[PDB]
């Protein structure tokens, strides 16, 4: 129940990155994938006998919506003078029925994911901006546990689905601060580890 959902959520947070220029490093990948959400980890291939990575890496995000946006955007983009391949891990299958269940459950909500939120922007002023598409039920930015500094992303929940669709359409890649917002619909319901019979 709650255990197999956690297993799929963990796979949903990871994105495969292939065709990485041999001279490119972990920081180049970090800067490139950080706009979609804060990076939890970068697992990179290493050929001990040949030196330098084996052209691919696994970027792990904190939330599955970040991985979905980094997949939609970022695939085929040029990095270091080589077009990268962005996909999902090979074992994403035989986990897919739960990924599809989480997607069905997400459709019951009018929740959107927002990344690349400028550090100086707060909760209420992000709420005021996105309130242009309709009445907002909740608007919350993710915070750092130590300092109350937000992590550059959050979730907005709308009363109507039209508002939700309008917001993603009109606000993805919007110039708010020096940063371009990355906005997508949620791919999970709020708190996916619930399964309430
Ligand atoms: Cl501006």
Swiss-Prot record:
Modified residues (Phosphoserine): 128
Domain of life, source organism: Eukaryota
Subcellular compartments: Nucleus
Record annotation: effect of changing residue 53 to Y: In VRJS; loss of function mutation; results in altered dosage of different PUF60 protein forms and abnormal splicing profile of several target genes
Expressing tissues: Isoform 2 is expressed in colonic epithelium and colorectal epithelium cancer (at protein level). Isoform 6 is expressed in colorectal epithelial cancer but below detection level in colonic epithelium. Expressed in heart, brain, placenta, lung, liver, skeletal muscle, kidney, pancreas, spleen, thymus, prostate, testis, ovary, small intestine, colon and peripheral blood leukocytes.
Domain RRM: 13-91, 110-188
Residues found modified as N6-acetyllysine: 135
Subunit structure: Homodimer. Associates with the spliceosome. Found in a complex with RO60 and Y5 RNA. Found in a complex with FUBP1 and far upstream element (FUSE) DNA segment. Interacts directly with ERCC3. Interacts with CDK7 and GTF2H1. Interacts with SRSF11/P54. Does not interact with ERCC3 in xeroderma pigmentosum complementation group B (XPB) cells. Interacts with ARGLU1; interaction may be involved in ARGLU1-mediated modulation of alternative splicing.
Family stated for the protein in its record: Belongs to the RRM half pint family.
Disorder named in the UniProt entry: Verheij syndrome: A syndrome characterized by growth retardation, delayed psychomotor development, dysmorphic facial features, and skeletal, mainly vertebral, abnormalities. Additional variable features may include coloboma, renal defects, and cardiac defects.
Domains (record comment): The third RNA recognition motif, called PUMP domain, is atypical and may rather mediate homodimerization and/or protein-protein interactions.
Remarks, miscellaneous: Does not repress TFIIH-mediated transcription in xeroderma pigmentosum complementation group B (XPB) cells.
Function recorded in the entry: DNA- and RNA-binding protein, involved in several nuclear processes such as pre-mRNA splicing, apoptosis and transcription regulation. In association with FUBP1 regulates MYC transcription at the P2 promoter through the core-TFIIH basal transcription factor. Acts as a transcriptional repressor through the core-TFIIH basal transcription factor. Represses FUBP1-induced transcriptional activation but not basal transcription. Decreases ERCC3 helicase activity. Does not repress TFIIH-mediated transcription in xeroderma pigmentosum complementation group B (XPB) cells.
The name this protein goes by in its record: Poly(U)-binding-splicing factor PUF60
Gene: PUF60
Range within the parent protein: 118 to 313 of 559
């Amino acid at each position: 129940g709650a255990a197999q959902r956690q297993r799929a959520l963990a796979i949903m947070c990871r994105v495969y990155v292939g065709s990485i220029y041999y001279e490119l490093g972990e920081d180049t990948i970090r800067q490139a994938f950080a706009p979609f959400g804060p990076i939890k980890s970068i697992d990179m291939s290493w050929d001990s006998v040949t030196m330098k990575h084996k052209g691919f890496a696994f970027v792990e995000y904190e939330v599955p919506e970040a991985a979905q946006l980094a997949l939609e955007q970022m695939n085929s983009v040029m990095l270091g003078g080589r077009n990268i391949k962005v996909g999902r891990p090979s074992n994403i299958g035989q986990a897919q029925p739960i990924i599809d269940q989480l997607a069905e459950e997400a459709r019951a909500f009018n929740r959107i994911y927002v990344a690349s939120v400028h550090q100086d922007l707060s909760d209420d002023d992000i709420k005021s901006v996105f309130e242009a598409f309709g009445k907002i039920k909740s608007c919350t930015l993710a915070r750092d546990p130590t300092t109350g500094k937000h992590k550059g992303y959050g979730f907005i929940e709308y009363e109507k689905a039209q508002s939700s669709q309008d917001a993603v359409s009109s606000m993805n890649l919007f110039d708010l601060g020096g940063q371009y917002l990355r906005v997508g619909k949620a791919v999970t319901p709020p708190m996916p580890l619930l399964t309430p019979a």
